[PDB]
Amino acid sequence: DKIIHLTDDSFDTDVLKADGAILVDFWAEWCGPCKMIAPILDEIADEYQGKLTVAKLNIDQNPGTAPKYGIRGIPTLLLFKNGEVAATKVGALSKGQLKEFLDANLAGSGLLCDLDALFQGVPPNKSIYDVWV
């Protein structure tokens, strides 16, 4: 398996000082919707190999990390990139909603000095109505 299980002690090394992007899952044994995404994370961890690392932090066994980042509800996903919080996704979600979240934020860096990396691929599309009008 390719999922790191974090602790409050190991969180510094495994996440903040990690290479590439790390997806940190905040969960607990009593979180219903947290168990919903648990199998999805395994599929993500295997399909996004080499470009993303999936990490889980149990907030019961590790209560120190969650409040520091203002995590007040679970499930909560923090996407870390080179020490910073790149993006955040809250609540239960489908495998498709998780992919859309990942695809849009695996920008890499840490910009603006690497902003060019965002134009060296195939641009995504929106409709003006996607602003919801």
Partner: protein, 194 residues
């Protein structure tokens, strides 16, 4: 670092027309607050960039067919430090404006479809000022990157991106590039100090 001035140039933007990956025609320098880019043939209008009269020796049948559908095209206008685009054409236009994408939290490379009749703010000077301020703090390399934030690309009729057969803008038959001179001048006052 000396504070810059949010002054506006006489010509608020420059527009360059392309077919596929080839420049076609000369650059149009907008001196009017409101103007159009259309597929018709008036050569002497400061408020109209007419693409219909433009020749291209290497033009194919596809490009010619698409040109026929530009019609009234896009109306571009500048109000209170903001730039807008209105789709006058009977076909949609597709806009890639990083400054616009930023406003909605979209991917900065996002191509946005503007259907006929619709209006969209494609640039706001203050959003750019905010980004420029973040760059100064992040260093010089970040500031150089802001040049493309002063540019907007727009395609007539045909879309491009992940949802279309055309993956890149140079695969569309009719597109334009806008340079916003104000932000470029502001960027310059920063660049020459760093």
């Amino acid at each position: 670092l000396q504070p810059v001035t949010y002054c506006e140039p006489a010509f608020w933007c420059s527009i360059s027309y392309y077919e596929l990956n080839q420049r076609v025609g000369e650059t149009f320098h907008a001196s009017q607050p409101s103007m159009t880019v259309d597929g018709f043939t008036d050569p002497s209008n400061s408020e109209r960039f007419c693409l219909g009269l433009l020749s291209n020796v290497n033009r194919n049948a596809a490009v010619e067919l698409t040109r026929r559908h530009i019609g009234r095209g896009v109306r571009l206008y500048y109000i209170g430090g903001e730039v807008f685009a209105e789709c006058l054409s009977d076909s949609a236009i597709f806009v890639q404006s990083p400054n616009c994408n930023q406003r909605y939290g979209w991917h900065p490379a996002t191509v946005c479809k503007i259907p006929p009749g619709c209006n969209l703010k494609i640039f706001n000077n203050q959003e750019f000022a905010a980004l420029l301020a973040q760059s100064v703090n992040q260093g010089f390399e970040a500031v150089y990157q802001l040049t493309r934030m002063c540019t907007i690309r727009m395609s007539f009729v045909k879309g491009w991106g992940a949802e279309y057969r055309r993956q890149t803008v140079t695969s569309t038959p009719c597109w334009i590039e806008l340079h916003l001179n104000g932000p470029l001048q502001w960027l310059d006052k920063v660049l020459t100090q760093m």
